[PDB]
């Protein structure tokens, strides 16, 4: 890649991101006053743990579907062997969803858009993983403080996925090249827009991985205590990526 070509990569990635979001950011912002009542929050909190897990896994699976669509749009992805496509998605799809979550998060009142209204972390109390949920909301709060542009969150999420260090890659040097192109595009864009200061403020590496690990650990406990629920009422895509 040359200068015009680096800038074309920036543009391609941004368009891929915008085209594969669940909801438009303007529609999320316009709904910020629409907040779950105390009664509605209590309804969620009182739901059985298995049912709330099932419901949340359904929404998580839908979000993952959009991340797969995003991945399919990135240069080089569709040309990797299926092993490597799946390696990258297993290692990174949940990470991408956790980064995308900041679009739905309102830092002013620490709420997220879930099932048509905004609610706080206490909405999810029935899941029995409150430490994890708290850590996820704090991660969104950290990302909100960065005030990502569309370009910046598009490129940063591409880099979450296109990571040549993932164990199990059969074409590691190809993924290295893809990752480098993306890094150079990202850093070029930050240089041009006087936004290089965000690089020092991005979450440490390890942070996303730790949230993703916590999920898998919690899922292990759930699935052990409720194996028929998982078999019968969790989505196949979820089970393929996490169980």
């Amino acid at each position: 890649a040359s200068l015009t070509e680096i800038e074309h990569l920036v543009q391609s990635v941004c368009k891929s991101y915008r085209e594969t979001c669940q909801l438009r950011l303007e529609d999320l912002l316009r709904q910020r006053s629409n907040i779950f009542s105390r009664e509605e929050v209590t309804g969620y909190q009182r739901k059985s743990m298995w049912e709330m897990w099932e419901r949340c896994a359904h929404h998580l699976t839908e979000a993952i579907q959009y991340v797969v669509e995003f991945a399919k749009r990135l240069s080089g992805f569709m040309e990797l062997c299926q092993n490597d496509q799946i390696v990258l998605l297993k290692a990174g799809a949940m990470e991408v969803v956790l980064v995308r979550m900041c679009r739905a998060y309102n830092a002013d009142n620490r709420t997220v858009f879930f099932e048509g209204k905004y609610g706080g972390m206490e909405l999810f109390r029935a899941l029995g993983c409150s430490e994890l949920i708290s850590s996820i909301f704090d991660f969104s709060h950290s990302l909100s403080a960065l005030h990502f542009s569309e370009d910046e969150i598009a490129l940063y999420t591409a880099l979450v996925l296109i990571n040549a260090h993932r164990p199990g890659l059969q074409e590691k040097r190809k993924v290295e090249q893809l990752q480098y192109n993306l890094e150079l595009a990202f850093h070029h864009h930050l240089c041009k827009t006087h936004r290089q200061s965000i690089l020092a403020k991005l979450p440490p590496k390890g942070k996303l991985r730790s949230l993703c690990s916590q999920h898998v650990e919690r899922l292990q406990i759930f699935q052990h205590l409720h194996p028929i629920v998982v078999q019968a009422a969790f989505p196949p895509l979820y089970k393929e990526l996490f169980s």
Binding site: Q65, V68, K72, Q82, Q85, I86, P236, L237, E240, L241
Partner: peptide, 8 residues
């Protein structure tokens, strides 16, 4: 696999 299917 669902994931294989979604990939094409």
């Amino acid at each position: 696999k669902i994931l294989h299917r979604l990939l094409q």
